[PDB]
Amino acid sequence: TTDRSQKLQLRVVPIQTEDNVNYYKARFTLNVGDNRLVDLGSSYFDIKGT
């Protein structure tokens, strides 16, 4: 484990969404920075509506 200040759980809001009658697009930009490492088993959406 390192010591430098980096975070644990990334929250990315979408770049641009397309709201349609039939679907709803979400596009994200995931920056895996230098000296960082992501397993996408932990990747999940946190969607919220009525």
């Binding site: 975070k7 759980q9 929250r11």
Partner: protein, 50 residues
């Protein structure tokens, strides 16, 4: 607003109180500052850094 009044006919009328309604000084109270419910966000495209 009927300063005095008796039963139909003889009455005086004082004018209504001066009530000025406008925005606050410096637009205080339009923008949620210091609330845990409603917090703004300036962030980069390293998304999580708020």
């Amino acid at each position: 607003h009927f300063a005095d009044f008796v039963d139909d006919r003889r009455a005086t009328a004082a004018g209504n109180r001066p009530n000025y309604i406008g925005f606050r000084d410096n637009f205080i109270g339009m923008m949620y500052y210091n609330s845990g419910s409603n917090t703004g966000s300036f962030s980069s495209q390293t998304q999580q850094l708020n």
